[PDB]
Each structure stands twice: as C-alpha cells, then as structure tokens.
C-alpha cells in the first residue's frame, strides 16, 4: 500500500500542476503530497528499498531534504491560510520553494520586477536583480506583508516593527565584485539612484 499511496502522491502534484491554481488551499495540498511522496521514498530507504513498483527511490539525504523542504511549505502555508493573506490569489510559483528561497530568505513573495544596476558609468557592465513588491514574513506576531524595493545602498524591506529600510543585499557589496571605481547606478522603476562604496 505504500507503492499506491506513492502512486497517489504523485498523481496529485502532477493533477494539481496540470491545474495551476490561485488557490491557497490547492498549494497546501499539492505540498502536502510531496511531503508523502519523499517521506515514503526516505522510508523505502532505509529498509534497502532502491526501486518502488515502476520508480527508483532516490538517495535517502536527497529523499529527507525534499520532504523537509514540503513541511516547512505546507506548515508555513497552513499558518497563512489562517491569516488576512489566505484569501489572496496565489499561484504554484509564488508558492514554488526556489520563490520561498529567493531573497530575502524564508518568505512568500509577489509581484516581481527587475532592478538592474550599471557600474562603471558602462552601460555593459550591468547586472541585474529580481525584486518582489510584496513579502509575507512571519514575525513572533505570526505573518505580515512586507513591500521591497531598491535604491542606492541595496535592496531592502520595510515593515513596521523597526520603522526604517532593513537591507537584504548591499549594491556596495555587487561594485566590489562587478566594478573598477566603485560607482553605480541602480534602476528601480522609474527612479535612477547613484552609489559609491
């Protein structure tokens, strides 16, 4: 019964990706499964189990990791539905774990757009930088919408626990890197900022 539980688990991602909902609750679901999935491929493996009916059973750290990564989703995104946030549309990417993990770390994030930064006053020394408009970060005072932007120093997000921009990543960090002189400036939207380090 674990070989159709599997079977189960997979089908359900696969279902629910086919699918692609907005709905919160559909993400827990789908996270739910790959929790079960990977927990009954890590336990196959630590019997010895190397192929489950049709399917190999990945390295057993591989297996634990995934399952891991599925619990912190689902127990994160369970603790969201009962917030103010729950009701909000949210797609399988802003609930994709590369989304939770992108910066800053450990947070479900909207509305993407890219920040792009020139160092030497050259045009092709540029890079750039994907920034989410909304943040939901779980404080001690469970979650909150937090908004991110850029300017001359980094990308930062405010909220109001410690009013003022908390940094996440410092531009003078990226010119060290990407610049000869030091300088740069960055394109948010449709402010231009300058920097030095």
Known sequence: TACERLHVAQETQMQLIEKSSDKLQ????????????????????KKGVTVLGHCRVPHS??????????????????????????????????????????????????????????????????????????????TEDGWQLAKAGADGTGLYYCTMAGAGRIYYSAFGDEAARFSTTGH????DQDRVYAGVS
């Open 61 to 138: 750290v591989v297996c634990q990791e995934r399952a891991k990564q599925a619990i912190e989703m689902q127990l994160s995104l369970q603790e969201l539905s009962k917030t103010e946030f729950g009701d909000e549309p949210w797609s399988l990417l802003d609930t994709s774990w590369d989304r939770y993990m992108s910066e800053p770390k450990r947070c479900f994030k909207k509305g993407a757009r890219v920040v792009e930064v020139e160092f030497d006053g050259n045009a092709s020394n540029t890079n750039w930088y994907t920034v989410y408009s909304n943040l939901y970060m779980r």
């Open 184 to 187: 740069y400036s960055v394109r």
């Open 26 to 45: 559909d993400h827990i679901l789908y996270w739910t499964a790959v929790r079960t999935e990977n927990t009954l491929l890590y336990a196959a493996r």
